[PDB]
Each structure stands twice: as C-alpha cells, then as structure tokens.
Amino acid sequence: RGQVFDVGPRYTNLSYIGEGAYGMVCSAYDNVNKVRVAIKKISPFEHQTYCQRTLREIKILLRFRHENIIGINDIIRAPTIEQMKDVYIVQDLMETDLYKLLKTQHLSNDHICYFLYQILRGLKYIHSANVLHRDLKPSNLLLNTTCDLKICDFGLARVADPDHDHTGFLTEYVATRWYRAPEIMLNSKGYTKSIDIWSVGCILAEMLSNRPIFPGKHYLDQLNHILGILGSPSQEDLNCIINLKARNYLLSLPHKNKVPWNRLFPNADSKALDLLDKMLTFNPHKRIEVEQALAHPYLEQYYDPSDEPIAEAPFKFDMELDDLPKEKLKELIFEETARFQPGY
Ligand SMILES: O=C(NCc1ccccc1)c1cc(-c2n[nH]cc2-c2cccc(Cl)c2)c[nH]1
C-alpha cells in the first residue's frame, strides 16, 4: 500500500501498520511458519546517517537473543549490492507499543510492575553486551496480546564509553527529548549506562499517570522541567559538575524545592515511587543501576537472577562506522544481511 512493498513470495497479505523516516512497516503472512509477522522497509542508502542507524541496528539485533528484545527473523534484499535500493527487516509481530496504550488505557499497578520488570530484564541484557540503547521510550516498547514486552529500535544504540563521556554545556543531542537525562544538557555525551536508567524512570513515571513526566518544548526547557520536580541539585551533586558554564547555570537558578512523588502520584504504589526516585536521581553516579533496579522490593514477585540472562559476549569497542562514507556502509549493510539470502 502507498508505495512499493516488495517482500517476495514468502510473505503475503500486506497490511499497513505505520512508518516514519527512512522506513515503513506492514504486517504479512509467513508461508514457511504460517504465522503473521511484521516487516519494515528501509531506504537508507541516500545519506550516511540513515545507513549508520541501519547498520548498528542490524548488527546488534542480529547478535542479541533475548525475550524482551525484538529480534530479526529474516532480512530480504536484492542479490547484488548494485541492485539493492531497499532492505526489508522481518521481526516479531506485536499487537501494539506502549505509546498507544498510554493514550487510552489506564494501567494497573500489576501491569505497571510487570511492564517495568520486562523493560529492566531486557535492559540488563543490553548493558551486559556493553551496549546503550540511548532512545528508550514508550513507542520503542512493543507489547503483544498477552502483554509480553520487547524493546525495539537500536538505531541510536552505541557501545558504552564512560571514559570519553564528558563534553561542554548545552551540547546538541539526537535522542528523544522528554527522556534525555539532566547531564545530557550539562556535560554528558550519552556514553554511560546511566543514560538508559533515567529514561526507564521517565517511562515508569509516565506509566503511573499516562502523562510524560518531563515534557520540555525545547532543548533547555527539558532541564527546567526536571529541575522543577527534583528541585535544586545539592552541593555535592553540584561539585561533580566540573564544567564551569554548566555549574554556573545551575547556580544562577533560584532555589527550588523537590516535589514529593506521592504529591504527583497519589494512588501510586509506595515501593514503585521509591524505585522511581532511585531511577530519576539527578546525580548519574548515584543513579540506581539496572541490576539493582531488578533486586528492588517493587519487582520482588518477578525478580530471579537465574532467569535474567546476560550477553554471551559484548562489543569490544565503539563501532568505527562514525565517520565512514555512504559507500562503505552500504557494502557493510550488504555483508551483514548475507546469511538470509538463499544462495548462502
Ligand atoms: O523497528 C521497529 N520500529 C522502530 C522504527 C524505526 C524507524 C522507522 C520505523 C520503525 C519495529 C516495530 C515492529 C512492530 N512489530 N509489531 C508491531 C510493530 C509496530 C508497532 C507500532 C508502529 C510500528 Cl511502525 C510498528 C517491528 N519492527
């Protein structure tokens, strides 16, 4: 529908689901497994940025194997790099994403607790492979008819690099704004696992009220919203911010008191709010880690370290495809998708 969707013989009966930039997603029938599946068309070979997000995601999703992470069952493309204009990614078909649910459905504490658990169970695996998602948000969280959750879209995911994390004040950033951590606008490049935890916390706050917690309308407004609820950062939290332009801005701000979680979330579970507090901690070094998040009393009826697997092996270092030209990426996208062609 709309435009060309050439998913070959093995997939039939196309139904539009949704799209976006350099992509488009339909549902089809897998004749080999007799089950309906989701397929996403990708046309990234235009400029490097698309190719870059497409290579990462294919490279990661293909090495990752986890119940709460979306997998790639199949990849359809042309037999030659010279004929390849599009690439099709076959993935599990899910009923919906968390973004849609929050629009019309009120979640029970049980649903909130289970959804939270699956997010962290999957995030733990991701960080085990030394990888950051870096764009966690409701729309990147898929649910099926029995409320099984799968994290998707690793287009902004990078290998963790905490040693080269520092940067100047008000540094431009690409991930979704409502879920950007405080330090992003202050002095962080986003190469620390503490980036993801913050977003999860934003997500946990949004699940409690069906509203985004920090809905900034622009870059610096995002920091205002956060400071408006957590209140002024303490002296010790302020001493960790060594960058002067960053520290002075915070200093130039009038003293603001923190708003009690139970003031914002009246009918929320106390154990939930306590964990929310740990996740939405201003100081990234103090912010609770994922494996602590699971061991938290709130997730007590699900927590089981033996049933929450980690990666067999991480990614050695940051993927160097950062300054790699359009041509080499297409070649790499081509080489990464080879295992799915019949002549292989
Ligand atoms: O990768 C995915 N989404 C992220 C994304 C990035 C760029 C462009 C489009 C989608 C994705 C979603 C799904 C999916 N499975 N079942 C339902 C979906 C789905 C739900 C809501 C919206 C879409 Cl567009 C797709 C499979 N892959």
Side-chain angles (χ1 to χ4, degrees), residues 1-21 23-344:
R1 191 206 301 255
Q3 62 125 166
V4 177
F5 212 78
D6 194 30
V7 297
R10 194 249 267 247
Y11 303 99
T12 58
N13 297 235
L14 303 182
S15 179
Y16 182 92
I17 300 299
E19 57 173 335
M24 204 230 306
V25 177
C26 297
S27 57
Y29 183 75
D30 176 354
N31 305 134
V32 179
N33 293 318
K34 299 307 188 62
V35 301
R36 292 196 60 79
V37 302
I39 299 178
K40 177 179 53 174
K41 176 180 180 179
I42 297 185
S43 314
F45 305 115
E46 171 234 33
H47 290 115
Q48 179 203 5
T49 299
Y50 295 155
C51 295
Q52 187 170 163
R53 301 170 66 128
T54 300
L55 210 195
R56 296 190 209 273
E57 180 177 81
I58 295 180
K59 181 105 70 175
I60 297 177
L61 268 44
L62 234 47
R63 184 186 294 194
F64 281 10
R65 185 83 178 186
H66 189 96
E67 303 166 14
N68 298 108
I69 299 183
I70 186 60
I72 299 181
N73 309 320
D74 189 17
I75 299 180
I76 300 180
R77 69 167 208 299
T80 65
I81 180 178
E82 312 184 17
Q83 298 174 103
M84 173 177 55
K85 307 297 172 55
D86 305 330
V87 183
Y88 297 87
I89 300 180
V90 180
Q91 297 173 100
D92 294 329
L93 203 183
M94 311 295 278
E95 181 183 359
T96 184
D97 55 43
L98 187 58
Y99 179 85
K100 299 189 215 66
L101 277 192
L102 292 172
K103 283 157 65 178
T104 65
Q105 303 310 303
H106 172 82
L107 285 50
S108 67
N109 183 224
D110 281 336
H111 280 91
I112 297 181
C113 182
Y114 184 52
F115 291 166
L116 181 70
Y117 171 78
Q118 300 186 78
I119 298 179
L120 293 177
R121 185 178 185 263
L123 189 53
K124 174 192 175 188
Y125 179 92
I126 300 176
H127 290 172
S128 292
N130 188 39
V131 181
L132 313 173
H133 187 279
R134 276 170 46 106
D135 195 36
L136 293 172
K137 53 175 173 172
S139 64
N140 281 322
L141 302 179
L142 310 180
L143 299 308
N144 64 23
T145 66
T146 57
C147 287
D148 299 305
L149 182 156
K150 295 190 194 284
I151 304 174
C152 69
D153 193 350
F154 284 59
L156 290 177
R158 302 176 97 91
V159 175
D161 193 11
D163 287 343
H164 304 84
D165 184 60
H166 304 288
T167 185
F169 176 46
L170 296 180
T171 297
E172 298 305 321
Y173 193 70
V174 291
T176 300
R177 187 196 301 112
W178 294 350
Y179 310 88
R180 294 183 188 170
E183 56 277 7
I184 291 297
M185 292 72 80
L186 290 178
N187 67 174
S188 183
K189 239 183 287 179
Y191 297 165
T192 300
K193 299 178 189 177
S194 62
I195 270 294
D196 287 341
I197 298 298
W198 179 268
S199 299
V200 177
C202 288
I203 299 178
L204 192 278
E206 188 161 327
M207 279 193 286
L208 289 179
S209 299
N210 293 85
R211 294 193 182 188
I213 179 61
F214 312 121
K217 303 184 195 303
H218 43 94
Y219 185 94
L220 186 55
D221 186 40
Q222 182 55 43
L223 185 55
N224 299 160
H225 283 256
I226 295 179
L227 289 175
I229 295 183
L230 298 185
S232 304
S234 71
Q235 184 186 252
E236 188 206 339
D237 282 341
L238 201 48
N239 285 172
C240 291
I241 305 297
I242 184 64
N243 183 285
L244 248 187
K245 288 193 175 183
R247 181 198 298 262
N248 281 168
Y249 169 75
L250 294 175
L251 290 173
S252 70
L253 258 43
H255 175 63
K256 297 152 70 179
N257 287 132
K258 69 132 57 241
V259 182
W261 296 118
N262 35 301
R263 280 298 303 169
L264 277 171
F265 307 116
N267 56 61
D269 181 357
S270 57
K271 297 229 193 71
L273 297 182
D274 181 87
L275 175 49
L276 173 61
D277 188 60
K278 303 288 212 308
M279 283 172 154
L280 295 187
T281 293
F282 180 85
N283 184 350
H285 300 284
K286 299 178 183 178
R287 190 171 303 136
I288 187 174
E289 310 239 342
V290 59
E291 292 169 319
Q292 271 174 124
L294 295 165
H296 185 99
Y298 179 50
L299 303 170
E300 184 176 0
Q301 59 210 184
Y302 299 105
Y303 181 52
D304 184 8
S306 64
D307 188 40
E308 295 147 16
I310 60 182
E312 309 276 342
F315 288 55
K316 286 299 182 179
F317 232 135
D318 300 80
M319 295 151 61
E320 194 62 274
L321 50 72
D322 301 338
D323 73 339
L324 215 52
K326 302 185 301 294
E327 293 74 53
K328 290 304 172 185
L329 292 182
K330 178 172 188 178
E331 180 177 341
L332 294 179
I333 295 183
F334 183 79
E335 301 304 349
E336 289 290 327
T337 56
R339 61 251 264 174
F340 291 92
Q341 299 314 117
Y344 178 89

